[PDB]
Design a protein around this motif. Structure first.
Motif, PDB file in Angstrom:
ATOM      1  N   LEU A 257      -1.874  -7.724   3.533  1.00 26.72           N
ATOM      2  CA  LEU A 257      -1.425  -6.710   2.579  1.00 26.72           C
ATOM      3  C   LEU A 257      -2.437  -5.591   2.365  1.00 26.72           C
ATOM      4  O   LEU A 257      -3.547  -5.796   1.860  1.00 26.72           O
ATOM      5  CB  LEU A 257      -1.041  -7.323   1.234  1.00 26.72           C
ATOM      6  N   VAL A 258      -2.017  -4.390   2.726  1.00 28.87           N
ATOM      7  CA  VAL A 258      -2.905  -3.252   2.744  1.00 28.87           C
ATOM      8  C   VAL A 258      -2.210  -2.057   2.076  1.00 28.87           C
ATOM      9  O   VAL A 258      -0.975  -1.952   2.110  1.00 28.87           O
ATOM     10  CB  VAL A 258      -3.282  -2.931   4.192  1.00 28.87           C
ATOM     11  N   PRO A 259      -3.010  -1.188   1.430  1.00 27.67           N
ATOM     12  CA  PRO A 259      -2.656   0.069   0.759  1.00 27.67           C
ATOM     13  C   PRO A 259      -2.312   1.180   1.735  1.00 27.67           C
ATOM     14  O   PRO A 259      -3.184   1.564   2.513  1.00 27.67           O
ATOM     15  CB  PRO A 259      -3.948   0.454   0.024  1.00 27.67           C
ATOM     16  N   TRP A 260      -1.085   1.696   1.658  1.00 26.47           N
ATOM     17  CA  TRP A 260      -0.585   2.715   2.569  1.00 26.47           C
ATOM     18  C   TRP A 260      -0.508   4.065   1.869  1.00 26.47           C
ATOM     19  O   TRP A 260      -0.451   4.116   0.655  1.00 26.47           O
ATOM     20  CB  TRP A 260       0.784   2.296   3.110  1.00 26.47           C
ATOM     21  N   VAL A 261      -0.509   5.161   2.626  1.00 27.68           N
ATOM     22  CA  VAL A 261      -0.593   6.504   2.040  1.00 27.68           C
ATOM     23  C   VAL A 261       0.571   7.416   2.405  1.00 27.68           C
ATOM     24  O   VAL A 261       0.998   7.440   3.559  1.00 27.68           O
ATOM     25  CB  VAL A 261      -1.872   7.209   2.501  1.00 27.68           C
ATOM     26  N   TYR A 262       1.066   8.193   1.442  1.00 25.02           N
ATOM     27  CA  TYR A 262       2.121   9.159   1.745  1.00 25.02           C
ATOM     28  C   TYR A 262       1.819  10.620   1.407  1.00 25.02           C
ATOM     29  O   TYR A 262       1.198  10.927   0.394  1.00 25.02           O
ATOM     30  CB  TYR A 262       3.402   8.781   1.038  1.00 25.02           C
ATOM     31  N   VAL A 263       2.295  11.518   2.254  1.00 25.00           N
ATOM     32  CA  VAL A 263       2.328  12.917   1.916  1.00 25.00           C
ATOM     33  C   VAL A 263       3.785  13.292   1.892  1.00 25.00           C
ATOM     34  O   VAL A 263       4.532  12.870   2.758  1.00 25.00           O
ATOM     35  CB  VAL A 263       1.669  13.750   3.003  1.00 25.00           C
TER      36      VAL A 263
END
Ligand SMILES: [Fe+3]
Length: 270
Positions: free
Chosen positions: A150-156
């Protein structure tokens, strides 16, 4: 094309509950969440604004590349099979493109947009296409820290880029931190109303389940909260400004869309 202010079809919802932790409550994340869990969980979604104590480069900006995916806002709900690839951007150039777009399509309020946005999806009058990135102290509020405790994902995203209706992978929560940029609108349906949401979506949109029995795991369909409301579903709104978290509870249904160029980060967790 262009904004239509009288065709605005902004959904009348109740507001998601908003929480304002104190410096202690905010020293242990899992705890504070367990703290509010009982009061927030009946809504499916809540908005946690950090205390003053809290505090979150010229090359990640100008140099660090990432890919986008193309969205036909106007065909997110009404259509007779995913978001095709888009161009690649740096934060820098993706902003210049995102902001032009807003300047031309229309400075509007969160309500001005919202009601435009839905207009577009319920009742489009021209194709509109948008782009989005996606899947790019000491306290677990620094999202990278949680997987341990489980890892932190990023959005633009930009104005009108949306994230459609889904429920988190297993029974996870999803904690989300708006880093910088415009407001993200949310829509949340409480777990015990999951049946009403998909039951309601089969009802008014039979066709598409026909040819894609598994839409709900697709994340490519955006049902209107006005219409859920019609079949007695409880949709709670909430607006995530710069520097506030949103917390989706387990089994809880969640959609929303950005109000302009912004940049976020989330992590699952139970
Ligand atoms: Fe999610």
């Amino acid at each position: 094309a262009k904004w239509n202010p009288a065709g605005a079809r902004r959904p009348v919802l109740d507001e998601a509950p908003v929480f304002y932790p104190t410096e202690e409550e905010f020293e242990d994340t899992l705890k504070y969440i367990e703290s509010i869990r009982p009061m927030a969980e009946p809504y499916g979604i809540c908005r946690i604004v950090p205390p003053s104590s809290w505090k979150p480069d010229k090359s990640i900006w100008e140099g660090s590349k990432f890919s986008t995916r193309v969205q036909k806002v106007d065909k997110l709900q009404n259509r007779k099979f995913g978001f095709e690839p888009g161009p690649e951007f740096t934060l820098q150039t993706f902003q210049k493109y995102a902001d032009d777009f807003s300047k031309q399509y229309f400075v509007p309020s969160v309500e001005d947009i919202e009601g435009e946005y839905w207009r577009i999806v319920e009742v489009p009058t021209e194709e509109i296409e948008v782009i989005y990135g996606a899947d790019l102290a000491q306290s677990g509020w620094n999202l990278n820290n949680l997987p341990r405790l489980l890892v932190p994902w990023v959005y633009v995203g930009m104005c009108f880029s949306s994230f459609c209706w889904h429920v988190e992978d297993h029974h996870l929560y999803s904690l989300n931190y708006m880093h910088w940029g415009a407001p993200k609108l949310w829509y949340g349906v409480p777990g015990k109303d999951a049946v009403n949401l998909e039951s309601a979506m089969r009802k008014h949109l039979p066709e598409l389940f026909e040819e894609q029995p598994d839409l709900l795991h697709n994340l490519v369909t955006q049902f209107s909260p006005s219409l859920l409301k019609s079949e007695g579903v409880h949709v709670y709104r909430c607006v995530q400004h710069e520097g506030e978290f949103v917390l989706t509870f387990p089994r809880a249904y969640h959609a929303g869309f950005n109000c302009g160029f912004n940049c976020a980060e989330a992590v699952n967790v139970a």
